[PDB]
Amino acid sequence: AEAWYNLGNAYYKQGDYDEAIEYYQKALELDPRSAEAWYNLGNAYYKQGDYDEAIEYYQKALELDPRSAEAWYNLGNAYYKQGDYLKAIEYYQKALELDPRSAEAWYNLGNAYYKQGDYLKAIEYYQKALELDPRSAEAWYNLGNAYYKQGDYLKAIEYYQKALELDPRSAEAWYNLGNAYYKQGDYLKAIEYYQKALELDPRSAEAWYNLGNAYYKQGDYDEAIEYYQKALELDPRSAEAWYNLGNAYYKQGDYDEAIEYYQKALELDPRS
Ligand SMILES: [Ca+2]
Ligand SMILES: [Ca+2]
Ligand SMILES: [Ca+2]
Ligand SMILES: [Ca+2]
Ligand SMILES: [Ca+2]
Ligand SMILES: [Ca+2]
Ligand SMILES: [Ca+2]
């Protein structure tokens, strides 16, 4: 059993998941009670996107070791990957009962609540995960986003700042820092933060368009036009950029130009 299992593991570690599977099977015919082999089998399926199979084998493992926090968690992950967040929540909770000091189970429960739209729970769970281990830029950023969804921009900012100390190349944190400053009425700081996100992701049509909107809302149509042009160079099929370009001309009293861009917007999308 064990030698076959160790063979499977060596294949797994080298990323040969199909070979790992063959050898874990061999080990399981010789010892059908090896929860370790079931779980690793499951993992080898998970690694190929075969979530139905992973789940089956994780359940076998849990039959033999119902106190495997690891199997409960990976079960939760398989359901998470399939977008069944209610199941993910159930299994992560089962994991956390067995291992209540797992930062990963707390964080992922936070993620699942976030995906369900329960930002209050996301918050409580992210917080517990960061208590246990504050080293992930991503977790601080997600915490910030949850506060953002709850309209607490002042907390959002604090946590974005924390994400950015840990990872100042996070374009996402700069961008959302920008949004939070935007909603607090600090648009020049917003623009600054959008520009920083733009330096790190200069090929994002959406980020250029966003910056154009920021300028437009300040009545700087000169700059608005320039940014929308940039967005459209990156994505000529953006009805939204075409439309807002038309709006920027509209606001400047150039109606022939507004018409041209509005017409382009409406050829791409005739609903509004
Ligand atoms: Ca395969
Ligand atoms: Ca299949
Ligand atoms: Ca299937
Ligand atoms: Ca299925
Ligand atoms: Ca155990
Ligand atoms: Ca599915
Ligand atoms: Ca210009």
Q: How far is the CA of 166 from the centre of ligand 2 (A)?
A: 41
The span from the CA of 155 to the CA of 193, in Å, is: 17
Whether residue 6 is contained in a domain is answered as no
Whether residue 182 is contained in a domain is answered as no
Whether residue 266 is contained in a domain is answered as yes
Question: What is the SS3 assignment for the chain?
Answer: CHHHHHHHHHHHHHCCHHHHHHHHHHHHHHCCCCHHHHHHHHHHHHCCCCHHHHHHHHHHHHHHCCCCHHHHHHHHHHHHHCCCHHHHHHHHHHHHHHCCCCHHHHHHHHHHHHHHCCHHHHHHHHHHHHHHCCCCHHHHHHHHHHHHHCCCHHHHHHHHHHHHHHCCCCHHHHHHHHHHHHHCCCHHHHHHHHHHHHHHCCCCHHHHHHHHHHHHHCCCHHHHHHHHHHHHHHCCCCHHHHHHHHHHHHHCCCHHHHHHHHHHHHHHCCCC
Written as one letter, the residue type at 174 is W
How far is C-alpha 256 from the chain's CA centre? Answer: 42
Q: CATH no. for residue 242?
A: 1.25.40.10
- Which ligand is nearest the CA of 95, by number? 5
Q: How far is the CA of 226 from the centre of ligand 7 (A)?
A: 6
Whether residue 241 is contained in a domain is answered as yes
12 and 22 Cβ atoms separated by less than 8 Å: no
Q: How many domains does the chain have?
A: 1
Q: How far is the CA of 66 from the centre of ligand 1 (A)?
A: 28
Nearest to 144 by CA among 124, 173, 110, 115: 173
Residues after which the chain is broken (C–N above 2.5 A) are none
Q: How far is the CA of 52 from the centre of ligand 4 (A)?
A: 5
- Helices 239-251, 221-234: axis angle to 10 degrees equals 160
Kindly tell me the burial class for residue 69, based on how many C-beta atoms sit within 10 Å of its own C-beta (0-12, 13-18, 19 or more).
Answer: middle
Whether residue 1 is contained in a domain is answered as no
How distant, in Å, are the alpha carbons of 26, 108, 119, 142 from that of 129? Answer: 39, 9, 15, 11
How far is C-alpha 33 from the chain's CA centre? Answer: 37
Residues composing the chain = 272
Cited resolution, angstroms: 2.0
Q: How far is the CA of 150 from the centre of ligand 6 (A)?
A: 30
How distant, in Å, are the alpha carbons of 21, 192, 218, 249, 265 from that of 225? Answer: 57, 18, 13, 8, 15
**Spatial CB neighbours of 17, under 8 Å, sequence gap ≥ 6:** 11, 44, 45, 47, 48
Whether residue 267 is contained in a domain is answered as yes
Q: How far is the CA of 53 from the centre of ligand 3 (A)?
A: 8
- For residue 268, the enclosing domain spans 221-272
Neighbours of ion ligand 5 (CB under 5 A): 67
The span from the CA of 90 to the CA of 271, in Å, is: 41
